[PDB]
Design a binder for these strands. Structure first.
Lengths: 141, 129, 262, 56, 180, 61
RNA sequence: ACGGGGAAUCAGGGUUCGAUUCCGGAGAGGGAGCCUGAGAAACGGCUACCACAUCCAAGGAAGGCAGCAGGCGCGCAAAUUACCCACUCCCGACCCGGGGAGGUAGUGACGAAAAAUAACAAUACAGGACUCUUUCGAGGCCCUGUAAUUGGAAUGAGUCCACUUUAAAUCCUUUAACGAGGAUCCAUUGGAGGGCAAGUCUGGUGCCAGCAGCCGCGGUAAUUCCAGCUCCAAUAGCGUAUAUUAAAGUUGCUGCAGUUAAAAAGCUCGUAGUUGGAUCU
């Protein structure tokens, strides 16, 4: 059982401090290895240069070729695989051009079918993918 | 070993009341136990009790009117101010209509309502409803 | 910081000045002078915010530089001159005299006094010391030094100063049973008879005071200013006689006054 | 896998132009219309399941 | 440093469950019955009533002779009576907990303009207020959410400059009379 | 549109008005004319005069 | 990691944040050392070194925007090289001069408040209204809507005038003139399998393209993809990423667990720690 004494505040506080490190979320947030290992470096978005276009096979229950791009982040130079969400949107991206990439929605975790992909392309050539998909804007020549 | 003889007394009363018995033997007795029992009896929760006088420490036989839903101790005896009494009595009591928090006070051992009447705080001993 | 500060932010100004928050970034930093920065009312606040004789600081300067404002019998042209407790402000052009006297809310009231009362002021003696080959000296809360005071005058007493000549004309001792105002703390601006002084050597003495309505409070000895011998003040008091009504009685009085009109 | 099919279905679907229809009301009028539809006059309420967009 | 004030406050709270049929129906009923623009008006009145209830509850935990309980409960009850939400007979803090959102919704200027016969419907009432046709005492009020006080209720008139309340026919009538 | 609220002063004479009024309120009456230079021109002329010593300061600009 | 006042969230308890306009500290590219002065180890003062860097006639000379604008760079990420000392105050020998402090405008969907995008009437229709224990002979003193139906009224968005505002202006307010019937003066952002409000409607595609936070959908009747129609959620706002709070009684003081789901040391002794029987009017 736990200590119930008027002068056990030190023991209770120290035990909570120690046992908080056994929480995955707390340790990830407060240890610093996750921020060092995070390609964005704690940022919500990041810019990169599209190194190439790749096709990732969906995980076994599903069958599809998810169109991603290998990009290299400008801020630090890391190589990232970023999903290109909608259909035909891979036709908007051209190799060796600027691209704004966000997280995939699960805070550094792969989403759905696409394995090992935790980033998605948000903008290409400083115009959003949603504007290109709907025809609101066009690629700058 | 045994610390907080009041805790043992209250737990024995609780278990006897749950078993439906009409009398419970409490040993050892103490001043705090007697005052707590008097507080419980002034509200009609236990009824008359008797102190068997050994020559070492007291014993008590408490008659049990089947009204006690629960009598419990709070350990440690936290110091309670008047402004903090509502939070304690909202955490410990089943309703605002019945149930009492017992506090030891410079004015005596007494329930939270009478502690409010005397405008005084103290240390929480326990509760009963 | 290096050296002294010269500005006062409007929100760091004393709250009893009742300055608003949107007029500017700065409050008029009181000049150095007889009274402390937080226990004074600058001339600009008095002539602009209280009396509405001016709309801006430029007009306050225009009034002051015509030498129309006297403080304690002397013309002052500094618009941030620190005027404090018991100070007499005379405007001879408009023929009006005021004495800076605390309200029961702790604010300097616009308290108009007769020209005969404007001839003198009460001063709480801050210290008594011997200097200059046996000459006794007295220092008041007003920071004026008086040589050759009465031998009976001690610290915490109250003297009466004739502003024309600036010499002691009378004094009240700090005794139980004497009327006093409170010049600091929670009870600032309250007037009552001193009941008893509990002494704490090496610490702050506490003085208990009883209102004219029977309310008893207590302050530190440094916050007590003896006003009159017995229960009779030696100065005029504001419309509220130092009796601090509770908020319920204030509400009742306001409602009664409002319902009496129309 | 191959990247050849990228805008396959989106490019190969027949392009159907949006029909011209009168503008819908906005603000308090749209909420008034909704309130009238849901609450004021409702005939088909006889103990059966009806949805606002039922196609049957 | 600026001479500006940044005291600002959000006047509503978004519900915890976005798609709840019972709450959606209740809010739509309130909107249609009182001619409200959107759900934020319902949420604003709900937030007002919630803050009032929180204050009343916190006062009801004080001692019945507490100076603060007496003062602030009297002030709160006076404020609720002043806008007609509470009746003068029920001057206890326990009757605050019995108040509904519709009680506050009746006291809007739109509801009173409709209910005093100045408009044919609640939506006509709103467009009348928004078009500077309505005044309370001598002030032309233009805000539909203006909460009418008890003593301002009998001074809601039809504006001395509006075509409905004192002359100068409007743009349309003047143009048509000029045409023929 | 019912009413307009403003502030007003009535001076004992026009001389007191010229002495005590703000210069812009006198200019609204035509009784004052301000400098036609800007802050920029005055500031740069001052900083230019800072570079010369003696009577040559007046021989700037 | 500047500290605090404080901020977000929060039943009670807490958790996270606080570079940021108030108070205190520190610094002025990095160190160091000083002069003057009441006050500085000052940098819109000086001296030197270190880094960078400007002009040069090559001998020398001159530097410090973490001030206000502005530029480059960095990046996911942040505004005008504007006007004025009129206000608030500060400084000076000073009522008079000066102040990128400060104020005023410009940019501004950070965010917060208020609040348009229609209202009404008639007409045809529908519905109820103890309508007679069935068919417009007691069905318009009520109510609804595709109504591109018919009518007049009412308006400010806008444009423009004169005031007002203000140093001077702008804006708001106030007049006046024009300004609405697809009132085309046009509301969007997301979604419609469940969670979770809303279509197993139509066409296309056919484990492809894609959707899908999760479960899942797609292999020829796809309620889930791409579209059309319809619907519904919030609405001048809505979606996404990320951090954080509640949800999390999944950190548990309140208030969690430890037989088998994760878990009690192999077992004892034992110091600190924690906790300790009755009893004194």
């Amino acid at each position: 059982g736990k200590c119930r004494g008027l002068r056990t505040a030190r023991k209770l506080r120290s035990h909570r401090r120690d046992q908080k490190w056994h929480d995955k979320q707390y340790k990830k947030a407060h240890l610093g290895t996750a921020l060092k290992a995070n390609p964005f470096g704690g940022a919500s978005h990041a810019k990169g240069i599209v190194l190439e276009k790749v096709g990732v096979e969906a995980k076994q229950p599903n069958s599809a070729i998810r169109k991603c791009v290998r990009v290299q982040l400008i801020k630090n130079g890391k190589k990232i695989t970023a999903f290109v969400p909608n259909d035909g949107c891979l036709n908007f991206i051209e190799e060796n051009d600027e691209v704004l990439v966000a997280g995939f929605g699960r805070k550094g975790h792969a989403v759905g079918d696409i394995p090992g992909v935790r980033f998605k392309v948000v903008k290409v050539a400083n115009v959003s993918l949603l504007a290109l998909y709907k025809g609101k804007k066009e690629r700058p020549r | 070993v045994r610390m907080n003889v009041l805790a043992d007394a209250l737990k024995s009363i609780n278990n006897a009341e749950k078993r439906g018995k009409r009398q419970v033997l409490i040993r050892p007795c103490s001043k705090v136990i007697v005052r707590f029992l008097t507080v419980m009896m002034k509200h009609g929760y236990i009824g008359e009790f008797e102190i068997i006088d050994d020559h070492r420490a007291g014993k008590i036989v408490v008659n049990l009117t089947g009204r006690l839903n629960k009598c419990g101790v709070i350990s440690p005896r936290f110091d309670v101010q008047l402004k903090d009494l509502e939070k304690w009595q909202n955490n410990l009591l089943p309703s605002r209509q019945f149930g009492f928090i017992v506090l030891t006070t410079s004015a005596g051992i007494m329930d939270h309502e009478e502690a409010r009447r005397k405008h005084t705080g103290g240390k929480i001993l326990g509760f009963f409803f | 910081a290096r050296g002294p500060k010269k500005h006062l932010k409007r929100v760091a100004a004393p709250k009893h000045w009742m300055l608003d928050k949107l007029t500017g970034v700065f409050a008029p930093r009181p000049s150095t002078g007889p009274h402390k920065l937080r226990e004074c009312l600058p001339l600009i606040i008095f002539l602009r915010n209280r009396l509405k004789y001016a709309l801006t600081g430029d007009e306050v300067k225009k009034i002051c530089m015509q030498r129309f404002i006297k403080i304690d019998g002397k013309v002052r042209t500094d618009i941030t001159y620190p005027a404090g407790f018991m100070d007499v402000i005379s405007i001879d052009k408009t023929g009006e005299n005021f004495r800076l006297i605390y309200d029961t809310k702790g604010r300097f009231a616009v308290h108009r006094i007769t020209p005969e009362e404007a001839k003198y002021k009460l001063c709480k003696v801050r210290k008594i010391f011997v200097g200059t080959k046996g000459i006794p000296h007295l220092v008041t809360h007003d920071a004026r030094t008086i040589r050759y005071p009465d031998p009976l005058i001690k610290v915490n007493d109250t003297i009466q100063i004739d502003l024309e000549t600036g010499k002691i004309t009378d004094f009240i001792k700090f005794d139980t049973g004497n009327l006093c105002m409170v010049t600091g703390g929670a009870n600032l601006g309250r007037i009552g008879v001193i009941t008893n002084r509990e002494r704490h050597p090496g610490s702050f003495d506490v003085v208990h005071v009883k209102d004219a309505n029977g309310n008893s409070f207590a302050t530190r000895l440094s916050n007590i200013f003896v006003i009159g011998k017995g229960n009779k003040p030696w100065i005029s008091l504001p419309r509220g006689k130092g009796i601090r009504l509770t908020i319920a009685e204030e509400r009742d009085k306001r409602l009664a006054a409002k319902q009496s009109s129309g | 896998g191959s990247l050849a099919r990228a805008g396959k279905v989106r490019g190969q679907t027949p392009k159907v132009a949006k029909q011209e229809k009168k503008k819908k009301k906005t603000g308090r009028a749209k909420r008034r219309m909704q309130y009238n539809r849901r609450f004021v006059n409702v005939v088909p309420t006889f103990g059966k399941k009806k949805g606002p967009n039922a196609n049957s | 440093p600026v001479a500006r004030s940044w005291v600002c406050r959000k006047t509503y709270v978004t519900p915890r469950r976005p798609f709840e049929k019972s709450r959606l129906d209740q809010e739509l009923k309130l909107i249609g019955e009182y001619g409200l623009r959107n759900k934020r008006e319902v949420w604003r009145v709900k937030f007002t009533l919630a803050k009032i209830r929180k204050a009343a509850r916190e006062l009801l935990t004080l001692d019945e002779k507490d100076p603060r309980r007496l003062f602030e409960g009297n002030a709160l009850l006076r404020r609720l009576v002043r806008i007609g939400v509470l009746d003068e007979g029920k001057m206890k803090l326990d009757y605050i907990l019995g108040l509904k959102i519709e009680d506050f919704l009746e006291r809007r200027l739109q509801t009173q303009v409709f209910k005093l016969g100045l408009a044919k419907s609640i939506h006509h009432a709103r467009v009348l207020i928004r078009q500077r046709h309505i005044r309370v005492r001598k002030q032309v009020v233009n805000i539909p959410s203006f909460i009418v006080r008890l003593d301002s209720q009998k001074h809601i008139d039809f504006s001395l400059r509006s075509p409905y309340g004192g002359g100068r026919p409007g743009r349309v009538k003047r143009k048509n009379a000029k045409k023929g | 549109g019912g009413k307009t609220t403003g502030f007003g002063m009535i001076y004992d004479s026009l001389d007191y008005a010229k002495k005590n009024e703000p210069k812009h309120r006198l200019a609204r009456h035509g009784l004052y004319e301000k400098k036609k230079t800007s802050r920029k021109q005055r500031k740069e002329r001052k900083n230019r005069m800072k570079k010369v010593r003696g009577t040559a300061k007046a021989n700037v600009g």
